[PDB]
Symmetry: D2
Subunit: 326 residues, 4 copies
């Protein structure tokens, strides 16, 4: 489904691009959360609690949970699918955090990948993932976190144990297989040569190698007028065309929207496939004070935004995270 | 370099997407030409002359010639690169139409691919193609024409003799090789299966396979709100990421802009790689009357348009078609 | 189906390898035909006659026709499958040349490819191709011819019209598509790079690419001590493994034997996938005089030969050339 | 370089093929060691000692060490290259086992892989690997062991730590990368489909994928008449053509010989690329008595063997196991 890649340019130029592929309308919206909000990771289970240290600009999925976002300090989180994920084994009595609020937790409390990895390695809580609505798939996903320094951490749960890869070299991430096996698949195709032959299918590993090769070949610049379009360009390359279907594979997940986070200038770009314009939200022009209130930039009913979209931010109440089966 | 793909949806839905891949800034602008204009095929050689039978909205290359456009009747022309093109043999004394005006000639005089092919098969004129300016490649190009019925024609000049492939099934066109050999490369990759494996490099043959496979898999709809972004998503898949370079290969043809021409609703969409928005020009809202005045949609200034850009159309002079160095 | 590759080495070193894949057992046998023989290209229709000017060693298929062989002058003819072959148009009243003996006609009357192409381009006869007996395929095949010079011609019948590709660069031939489109597919993979990526599927275009790339990368030498084992290694790389099948694909054409013709030294090498040995028939030790008698190397009874097999040649009568489809 | 594949057929039919890909001539010879022989795993440092519990038929590499072979009880050990191999860390004081005799140690003392995996998991000794003589490569290799039950064990030394993968499904082994990562690359291509597209280059991962797909696609039969030629089909497909060279790559490792081990009938097949015949050593016709005499099948002098080669075994003395790199 999804595809993520991190560009590391000169003079702290860190730009993260993320693809969102889904078999149906994800109905994603943008929400602007100020700092100082208190939340809980679950409503019916024993849980942890926290007050948000940093405000964030996040994108939801079905308005039931957070899957991608960016906070004030340039830390970007992204929840990408992984069918082979098992968060815990039977009999785990740790405090349960819902899968929907897991991504919002790391954006609310950490300004550095070093900070997120150190706290998550404590394994104080388990991930609770019910089945997605509309009779959709099980919530088997992994996460990547990138700060303004270029460091990236890939978080995934395999048969109940925590697995982490930290380092600036882990810039790309897709879906299956496991992240160590994904690097082995990518290592093979680099021998073939990106200019010679590249796997151009919509498969998970195919988009991983194409994103890994192209993200290192785009110009090495610190100007946002060049970095953001070229990082977006490799996102559309690893994107899958809309409504792709064959008689033998009738329903396939098409790309619904894309996100490009300028972690240096603190700007969050966003584009939907069925809308013509690429808009953005300058976090430097957003008031994240605790008394600012929740603001929402809705995208469900086909609204068309352009340029800077802070003007079109409406006052709203935060969507309710879902932790249950329906 | 460039890639072209034609979508054949239900209820006479014809949408043609095209990419523009160039190593530097192509410096393309958009021009709105009214009907009834008089143009010549050259300025210093014997030629043919004609009065434009249909107005059109076109995109230029360095403002020296036309390489992409659509006219009143939904006929779309696109001039794509083909390094093995030889237009004539030495000693050709036919009238010499410049390569910069060849694309405009088709958009000015023909409303049907059947009409364009019948006139072209008389071979009244030859193509005089000087080299592109400032150390650029030599103007070896082939063209593709698609009308509102879905019929497509591929016109190539090989070994001085004109070759033409016309038919609704010729929906995709790229660069090398010649069109019959390109179809064999696509025939081989269809044996493998698009879902099983697709060649995913920026090569001409590879971009041809991905465009042909995806253009037949996108939804079969007549809604422009679904068909236009779908074929536009296919053109981005066959696009080349911006500024691609390696130590082995210092300069590589990068995608600079895209065009998606809705041939049923007569709408000409356009977006640039470095601009964030996708604007369009609705030809039904454009006055193509013989004395409406030439209008221009400038793009070299780095301007940013959104939605319908007919509001941003300004009075302008027709650009100078170059026929020499 | 079948793959053909021609090695062009220094000092007139011309070595041609060929594979043979089939659904079931081919029942192939090797026949040695001296000179001065008469053959009619058909049994019931109007036909052309000829007397053999050159003797040849040949391999059969089901003992109903010639599909691979080499004559005294170093000319090697190979008949490989081409599904889109259309030999004639309706209403053709030309003399009929049976497809079973079309390959023997080349080895019998021509010493260089120049003589074979000149005679074929006259289009005196048409190819009469009956259906293969007992539910077999349609007799749709094309032929490649190589002389000791190294010149090669690929002869195909497309839509009832004769098509020729002559030249020394035309060293490799497989099955479909036609040779013009087949070179376009091979050109694409040459843009990829043989060492960077090669298509390893047993299909026709992929075997063409590997044969095309590996036949040019083996050592350039005139020593048959090196060239023949190297050409065989190429034909083995492009050969498909034995008895390959999957649940989705129950029956797949599988290589059964390979032949490598040393056109310089007039040596005909041969091996079968089920037999452990690679034997040969040195044509310089064979008597092709008009009344030397027909000889045959039996291969259908599971025979095992080794080294030089001329001593193992047995007196035999020539097989029946099939020109119709037998009633079953 | 080289590749190894294990075939698992019905009725305990286990056949193991192996290629030998080398830059220059490998100078391999075949030795027949009877049981009850005493050897030491090193020459100058602290070492373990053992006496042969089972005799073995092995092939050498420069006759400085054992690289491939099979013992009396059907166990087959194969030492293939692995550049990233690190056998120990600085400061290791365990008994030193020479890499040249490691393969001999396995074929001498173990009848099943379970016995071998258990004894090696003790980590009693360390592998001592000097650089190959005369500017040769560093002796970085791994080994695969397969018994007559069909179970295979891949043993690799990664960052100075022993890594073992045991299981019937581990039937294929090449070189780089690590076996954990190597299976992931093959997992990727299995999604693409063997009949849709196979990587046809000579890369280590590519020959791995083609070997895995074709070793499962050959017919499942207990008949040796079909098994060992079908396993021969695979090892020939994953073999690399002889003397492959390009202007950018002057030296590429080409296949020099291939060995096929019938682990049910205890037969060791062998064929060289420059030799036309596939010969075999029947272990049931070989006497491994404590004093039957160490014998040798010489292959360095262009010898051509055929059929059962137990007749051509000459009494000889065993080669020197190299434990250092000789001074030049």
């Amino acid at each position: 489904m999804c595809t993520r890649a991190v560009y590391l340019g000169p003079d702290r130029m860190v730009v993260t691009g993320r693809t969102m592929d889904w078999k149906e309308d994800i109905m994603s919206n943008i929400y602007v959360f100020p700092r100082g909000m208190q939340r809980a990771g679950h409503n019916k289970e024993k849980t942890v609690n926290w007050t948000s240290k940093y405000g964030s600009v996040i994108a939801t999925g079905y308005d039931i949970g957070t899957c991608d976002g960016m906070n004030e300090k340039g830390l970007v989180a992204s929840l990408l699918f992984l069918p082979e994920s098992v968060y815990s084994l039977p009999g785990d009595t740790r405090p349960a955090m819902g899968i929907s609020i897991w991504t919002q937790y790391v954006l609310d409390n950490f300004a550095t990948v070093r900070e997120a990895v150190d706290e998550m390695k404590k394994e104080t809580f388990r991930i609770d993932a019910p089945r997605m609505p509309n009779g959709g798939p099980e919530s088997t996903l992994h996460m990547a976190i990138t700060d303004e320094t270029g460091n990236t951490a890939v978080i995934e749960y395999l048969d109940g144990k925590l697995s982490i890869h930290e380092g600036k070299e882990y810039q790309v991430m897709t879906n299956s297989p496991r992240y160590e096996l994904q690097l082995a698949v990518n290592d093979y195709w680099k021998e073939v040569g990106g200019l010679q032959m590249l796997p151009g299918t919509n498969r998970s590993s195919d988009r991983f190698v194409r994103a890994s090769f192209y993200i290192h070949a785009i110009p090495q610049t610190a100007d946002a007028k060049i970095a953001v379009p070229s990082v977006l360009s490799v996102m559309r390359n690893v994107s899958v065309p809309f409504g792709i279907n064959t008689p033998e594979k009738p329903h396939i997940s098409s790309t619904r929207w894309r996100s490009v986070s300028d972690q240096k200038n603190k700007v969050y770009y966003f584009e939907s496939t069925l809308t013509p314009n690429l808009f953005w939200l300058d976090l430097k022009k957003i008031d994240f004070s605790p008394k600012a209130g929740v603001k929402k930039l809705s995208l469900t009913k086909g609204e068309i935004y352009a340029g800077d979209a802070v003007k079109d931010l409406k006052d709203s109440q935060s969507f309710t995270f879902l932790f249950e089966t329906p």
